[PDB]
Amino acid sequence: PDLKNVKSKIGSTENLKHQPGGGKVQIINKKLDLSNVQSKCGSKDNIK
Amino acid sequence: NKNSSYFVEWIPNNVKTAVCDIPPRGLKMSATFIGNSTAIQELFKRISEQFTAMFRRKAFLHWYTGEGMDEMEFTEAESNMNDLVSEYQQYQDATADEQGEFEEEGEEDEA
């Protein structure tokens, strides 16, 4: 006898393209703007 | 005060108390803990590394794709879990950092 060609069915041989692929993460951080800010009591200029 | 190094240090004072007057049946007292450690990442690490070892081989996967799930459904899921895990690393041991980068001096010899 002869079998010519035969192969397995179905598993890890059909998976070899798809890893799958991974990704990327990031924070999750900010600031605030302070540029407007002055004190809200204010007598010391009255020295004038 | 005894255990400060097991605590996310940019979330200062990590506690919420509640105190009910009414005990468990026929007993003087109790308490209930609900904790948010990052250590929980070890379980989702396991389950992602385990999933990976079934999935890069198509183990058991015939049974679920047999109920109509597309390969994108398991890949989005795994990706989704992996993202949760990648985040948990980014919350773990972290410092109060403010996202700056290395800079250097100019010149004072104006033209």
Swiss-Prot record, chain A:
Annotated localization: Cytoplasm, Cytosol; Cell membrane; Cytoplasm, Cytoskeleton; Cell projection, Axon
**Which ranges does the UniProt record give for the Tau/MAP repeats?**
1-24, 25-48
Tissues expressed in: Expressed in neurons. Isoform PNS-tau is expressed in the peripheral nervous system while the others are expressed in the central nervous system.
Residues the record lists as Phosphoserine modifications:
12, 35, 43
Per the UniProt record, the site (Not glycated) maps to 4, 7, 17, 24, 40, 44, 48
Relate the protein's function as given in its record.
Answer: Promotes microtubule assembly and stability, and might be involved in the establishment and maintenance of neuronal polarity. The C-terminus binds axonal microtubules while the N-terminus binds neural plasma membrane components, suggesting that tau functions as a linker protein between both. Axonal polarity is predetermined by TAU/MAPT localization (in the neuronal cell) in the domain of the cell body defined by the centrosome. The short isoforms allow plasticity of the cytoskeleton whereas the longer isoforms may preferentially play a role in its stabilization.
The name under which this protein is listed is Microtubule-associated protein tau
Tell me what gene encodes this. MAPT
Placed within the complete protein, the shown segment runs 568 to 615 of 758
Swiss-Prot record, chain B:
Stated role: Tubulin is the major constituent of microtubules, a cylinder consisting of laterally associated linear protofilaments composed of alpha- and beta-tubulin heterodimers. Microtubules grow by the addition of GTP-tubulin dimers to the microtubule end, where a stabilizing cap forms. Below the cap, tubulin dimers are in GDP-bound state, owing to GTPase activity of alpha-tubulin.
Subunit composition and interactions: Dimer of alpha and beta chains. A typical microtubule is a hollow water-filled tube with an outer diameter of 25 nm and an inner diameter of 15 nM. Alpha-beta heterodimers associate head-to-tail to form protofilaments running lengthwise along the microtubule wall with the beta-tubulin subunit facing the microtubule plus end conferring a structural polarity. Microtubules usually have 13 protofilaments but different protofilament numbers can be found in some organisms and specialized cells. Interacts with NCKAP5L.
Its UniProt domain note says: The MREI motif is common among all beta-tubulin isoforms and may be critical for tubulin autoregulation.
- List all Acidic residues biased stretches: 95-111
The UniProt similarity line reads: Belongs to the tubulin family.
Q: How is it modified after translation?
A: Some glutamate residues at the C-terminus are polyglycylated, resulting in polyglycine chains on the gamma-carboxyl group. Glycylation is mainly limited to tubulin incorporated into axonemes (cilia and flagella) whereas glutamylation is prevalent in neuronal cells, centrioles, axonemes, and the mitotic spindle. Both modifications can coexist on the same protein on adjacent residues, and lowering polyglycylation levels increases polyglutamylation, and reciprocally. Cilia and flagella glycylation is required for their stability and maintenance. Flagella glycylation controls sperm motility. Some glutamate residues at the C-terminus are polyglutamylated, resulting in polyglutamate chains on the gamma-carboxyl group. Polyglutamylation plays a key role in microtubule severing by spastin (SPAST). SPAST preferentially recognizes and acts on microtubules decorated with short polyglutamate tails: severing activity by SPAST increases as the number of glutamates per tubulin rises from one to eight, but decreases beyond this glutamylation threshold.
In this UniProt entry, the residues modified to 5-glutamyl polyglutamate are 104
| Additional comment | The highly acidic C-terminal region may bind cations such as calcium. Pig brain contains at least two forms of this protein.
- Name of the featured protein: Tubulin beta chain
Specify the species.
Answer: Sus scrofa (Pig)
